[PDB]
Amino acid sequence: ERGWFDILDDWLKRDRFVFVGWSGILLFPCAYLALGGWLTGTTFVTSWYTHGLASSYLEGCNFLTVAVSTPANSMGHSLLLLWGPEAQGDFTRWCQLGGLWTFIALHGAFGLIGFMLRQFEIARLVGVRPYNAIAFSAPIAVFVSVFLIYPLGQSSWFFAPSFGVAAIFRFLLFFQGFHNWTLNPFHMMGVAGVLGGALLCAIHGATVENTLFQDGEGASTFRAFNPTQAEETYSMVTANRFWSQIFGIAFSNKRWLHFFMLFVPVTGLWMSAIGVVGLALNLRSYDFISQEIRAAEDPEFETFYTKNLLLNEGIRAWMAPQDQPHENFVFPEEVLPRGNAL
Amino acid sequence: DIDGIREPVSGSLLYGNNIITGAVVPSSNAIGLHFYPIWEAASLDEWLYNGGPYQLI
Amino acid sequence: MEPNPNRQPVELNRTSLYLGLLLILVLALLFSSYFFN
Amino acid sequence: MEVNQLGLIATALFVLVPSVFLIILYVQTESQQK
């Protein structure tokens, strides 16, 4: 068996500086177009006709404020293809209608698929187990739930996150004010997985570096390691005693330790994804009913929970007219919620 | 009374909170940065109204 | 009847017991507020 | 407070059912031949 397919497979799997692979055929153009689309938009392209915002270096934005913004709410969930019925093949109009947003979201999605396929392909060639790809399932679930499922549940792509620093900050604040997203136990598990993962990263790196064996004469200890060496470079036994005596418990099994390092942040991200799927439908953890019944009846009952809801109400009333221009909100001064003086 | 305006905020389980809403509440704005140990209060009831536990903790 | 040769013993070590109980109890401490609503 | 009346048994079984599963598995491991 040495036909054109096998010859191609040979070329695709050459050991070169940048490995290609069959997965490369999907991954390279899609990742390139997504990145190039973002750079192109943030440098040159407005959001005047979709959002009423300037969004590019060309208009005077900086790195923090540039974005490729979502299409107008009136576009619905249009794929907004360049040759589609909205832009009708007109590149300029396509940019003005927000076509770069779906360009980037879709090429980005297919590129992420390509990258996970790359993780599988390389693992298979090299003869290792595919846990890196498996762990990548968490980035996939986040991207798909946030940039795709979420706006698909809402009225249109307009409410997806826009690709920009400040734009993303706005997304966070929208979620606080409208969804009370910090109250959601799926977000809370996400937070624990992220902060716990960061904790594990720090503590494991630090522990290894402070239980090193002296394997050289240098006071800078990095050179006293050889990639081909059979011996552990640090003492698990000493590490175990230290942590047992400091914290009460300690790892004793290195395999379990590293598995756990995969488990914690990967599971956290998956949990946050589930919460966002509910938010696509406005299925929020917004309230505690018992709290509201009590507070409604008793004007002296106050908790941090009720205090945060008043903040959410402020966010909604003060941000909506400019953040949701298609609604044509006109909120007269007298109806705006405000405490004393401010 | 976290903000020193005689508007007490409930933080404990027995006083209407669950695990998510519950808190030990910061000491009063009337206190500011003044040191407020138990023995500065006329009584424990006073100490508690003004948020003494927050500082101790 | 002839015995089944596919049977395998099952195990849960003490550490795994402690980790599992911690997971369950913490999940309960977290979700209980929402079950009471 | 007007809580959900099923909250108590929901929480109780949420804790008890998997905890018991784990306890069963642990004890039968301990009793296996050393």
């Binding site: 036994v237 175990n240 047992s244 009460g248 418990i249 300690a250 004793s252 | 389980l13 027995l14 669950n18 695990i19 | 070590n13 003490r14 550490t15 402690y18 109980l21 911690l22 109890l25 913490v26 309960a28 401490l29 209980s32 507020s33 009471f36 | 407070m1 809580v3 909250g7 108590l8 929480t11 109780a12 804790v15």
Partner: peptide, 30 residues
């Protein structure tokens, strides 16, 4: 009953800490 439930779960957690620390399977060098 809510308060009792919260405090009970918490108490079980603290007990679990105790067993996990003082009645752990001892690590052994083979």
């Amino acid at each position: 009953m809510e308060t009792i439930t919260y405090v009970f779960i918490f108490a079980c957690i603290i007990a679990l800490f105790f067993f996990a620390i003082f009645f752990r399977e001892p690590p052994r060098i083979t």
